[PDB]
Write a structure and sequence with these properties.
This is part of a larger assembly, with one copy of chain A (398 residues) and two copies of chain B.
Chain A (H helix, E strand, L loop, with lengths): L2 E3 L6 H12 L12 E2 L13 H9 L4 E3 L9 H11 L3 E3 L17 E3 L6 H12 L6 E2 L7 H12 L20 H7 L7 E4 L6 H10 L8 E4 L8 E4 L9 H19 L32 E2 L2 E2 L12 E8 L3 E9 L65
Parallel strand pairs in A: 1-2, 1-3, 3-4, 4-5, 6-7, 7-8, 8-9
Antiparallel strand pairs in A: 9-12, 10-11, 12-13
Helix pairs in contact in A: 6-7
Chain B lengths: L1 H10 L3 E4 L23 H7 L1
The chains are: A alpha/beta (398), B mainly alpha (49).
PDB class: membrane protein
Keywords: N-methyl-D-aspartate receptor, (S)-DQP-997-74, GluN2B, GluN2D
Entry title: Gly-,Glu-,(S)-DQP-997-74 bound GluN1a-2B-2D NMDAR
Chain lengths: 398, 49, 387
Amino acid sequence: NVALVFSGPAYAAEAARLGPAVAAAVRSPGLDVRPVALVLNGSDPRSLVLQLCDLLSGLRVHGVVFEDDSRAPAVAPILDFLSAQTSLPIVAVHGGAALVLTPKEKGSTFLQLGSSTEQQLQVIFEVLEEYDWTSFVAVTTRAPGHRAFLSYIEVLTDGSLVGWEHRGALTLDPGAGEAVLSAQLRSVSAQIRLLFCAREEAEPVFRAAEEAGLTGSGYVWFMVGPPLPAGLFAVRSAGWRDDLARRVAAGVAVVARGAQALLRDYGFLPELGHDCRAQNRTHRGESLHRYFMNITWDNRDYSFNEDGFLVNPSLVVISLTRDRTWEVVGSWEQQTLRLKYPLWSRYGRFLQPVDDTQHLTVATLEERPFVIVEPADPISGTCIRDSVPCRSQPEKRC
Amino acid sequence: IDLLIKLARTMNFTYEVHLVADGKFGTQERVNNSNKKEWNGMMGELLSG
Amino acid sequence: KIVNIGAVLSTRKHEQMFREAVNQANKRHGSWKIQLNATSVTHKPNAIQMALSVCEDLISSQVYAILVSHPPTPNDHFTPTPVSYTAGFYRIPVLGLTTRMSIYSDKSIHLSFLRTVPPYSHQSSVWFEMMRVYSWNHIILLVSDDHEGRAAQKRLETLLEERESKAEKVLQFDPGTKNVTALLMEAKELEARVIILSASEDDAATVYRAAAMLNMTGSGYVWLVGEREISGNALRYAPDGILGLQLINGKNESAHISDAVGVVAQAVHELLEKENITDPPRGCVGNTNIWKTGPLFKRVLMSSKYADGVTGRVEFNEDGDRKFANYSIMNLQNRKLVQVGIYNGTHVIPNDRKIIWPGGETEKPRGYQMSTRLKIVTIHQEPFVYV
């Protein structure tokens, strides 16, 4: 018995068909799955506590899979307290309840399927060196977690054979004024700009970026958070993939395996959530998060951290095309950067020279005492120091 | 050793000489298994305590 | 045309003197549109009961602020957590008091939570300055393995990383203190004698008892400790030379709420501006949109000035906390407390009574001690060090 709680009027039509469809999708011995669809409406925290408790008292459901339509994450903390209160594991597939939440309440069984602000910083840096984009400028806004953002920036550049350079501003105020925002935007020494902005203030800074003259394909922007200038990239972690039925099938798979983790030691079905307020006791709680370490499904690791979020995801980077469409441009499958759209002919795809004409090509040959050409070291993955890349006419050589 | 004995008598302190675990001097030795780097050899032992 | 203030108090008797407190709210500065209602309930036995009781009563009057205080039962802050979620998602301001915890400090989750009373984690400021007049150079500290305990350690390590060469040891212990002794002798080798404790009420007495059989409370020691471990069962089993802390107006809410209500009233006068003053959403039977004027005066609310009540200097920083609060350093001797100083943002030490110290010594014991024996390392080099 699993509760398939939905959110949104458009989700009511598919609620009926998705019940039996996912019942046979995942099957485990000694475990009966009876998904229950909900046609509730409204985001007010009443159906989340009145009829939701009614299912716990009457239906006696163990394991709840949540689905949401709106992108606002302000409703996530409401169920975060509920999970720690009745000790019921709640899993959200996608929607508003997809952003990370650290730290979490003690003794909480909240499970999240998404990407935090730490792994995203790692993956974008591989793409930077892939296209020879070492020079960069990173800025941010007033954010709840920009302190850990800025601290993690210099750690990445502290190593590697390539010598990184860093610059950037501290914050920006959309209401300060159009000329005010462009006033401090001139302190830039790179063609690549990184920002961390909220959803509500995303548009004004982007609109005010046009007045700075930085909107064309000659400059690129990397979106860190979850009139559009060209060269926009983002990380979704299969957000646009896996459809809907396949996504909702993953949630019931981990829940089913979650039981088998504890039944193999001893076969017991807990009744903590059988009543919400009938019993005035919540001290009975053990192994709330001691399970769900080695969860394998769809040839992808589903290991969850102590905070209760995925640590081994299948991230994919999404690119914006000139026709205002979002498409994938590379893959990040188990610390792999195979990518697509090869990087040959630098200053070509995804980056144009707005001005300069200083990009003058030079032809060269090989003569041993004057110019020496040798292949690069595969382990280093980059040109050795005191050397220049030499594309052929393509494999990079020092 | 001869110089060390002279200092012990002059400043009135006692000692117990012990060798090093690995026969190497100090070196920064930045590695990927740690955050940034950690000292190794004789230099690290002094800072450890 | 009517500005409403909501609150939740402890007892039904506490619902009797509330109307006395709000009686003077109308007769205040200006009162252009200051017409209040009672809008108060009691503390529900269960958190889920308090979760849905916030909207049906306090929000039903369309209030613009919430007053939250600790429940009469000394539980784990049962009152603020349900309010901070439902009201936080509605972006409704809430004023806090009598709840001093470090969990409601980061703005990642609790976006809108301002309170005058400083948290337990702010005690670290007085520890550093207190040892300056006594000229204590380096310290060792014991921290319980918890977010509340770890917060004090973080504050200390950002203060003695520029004007000092860090601390001798930062050794930690698990909250489930059961025969916690194995790390005591580790601390009894570095010759510091100036140890600092910041544990909770229950485990602090366990540390003191574990420090009894190892003569850890003898002469030559100074125990710079916090506040909670002076009361409760920690009063017993404790040495006779403690230097515990205190708060002037702790556990007092009758005077605090009267002082707190006016601060909101002053900020209301700044609300009326060119921006829309549209009423917040009515009730919560059905609603999805979040109003936009909520976060438009949080800076106004946190920048308010009010010279009346407690010290007349209730100023809110970026977080929810006052400034230059009074701690009034205590002292313990022969199972009795006694005042030996006052702190008002700066170190002030009156004569009062001669300070007693652990072990019965009446003088000020310097914590530093020196060990003559010291270990020495060497390497194998032929002309210099043969082997």
